[PDB]
Amino acid sequence: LYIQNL
Amino acid sequence: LYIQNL
Amino acid sequence: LYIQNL
Amino acid sequence: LYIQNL
Amino acid sequence: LYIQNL
């Protein structure tokens, strides 16, 4: 599970 | 589980 | 579990 | 468990 | 458990 918020 | 908030 | 807040 | 707040 | 607050 990988989450990136940019 | 990887979370990055940028 | 890895969290980075930048 | 790794947390960095920057 | 590693916490850095910068």
Numbering used by the authors:
A (entry chain A), B (entry chain A), C (entry chain A), D (entry chain A), E (entry chain A): 1 to 6
Authors' description from the paper:
Crystals grown from both solvents contained β-strands of parallel orientation, but arranged in different amyloid topologies. In the monoclinic crystals grown from the ethanol containing solvent system, strands arranged in the class 3 topology could be observed, while the orthorhombic crystals grown in the absence of ethanol contained strands arranged according to the class 4 topology. Similarly to the class 3 structure, hydrophobic residues (Leu and Ile) form a hydrophobic niche in this arrangement too, while polar side chains of Asn and Gln stabilize the interface enforced by H-bonds. The side chain of Tyr2 forms H-bonds with chain termini. On the other hand, in the class 4 arrangement, the Tyr side chains face in the same direction, so that inter-β-sheet Tyr-Tyr interactions could not form at the zipper interface. Although the Tyr side chains also meet near the chain ends in this crystal form, the interplanar distance between them is 7.0 Å, indicating a much weaker, if any, type of interaction. While the class 4 structure did not contain any solvent molecules, the class 3 structure contained both water molecules and two ethanol molecules, one in a solvent channel near the chain termini and another wedged into the steric zipper interface.
Aggregation-prone-motifs (APRs) of proteins are short segments, which – as isolated peptides - form diverse amyloid-like crystals.
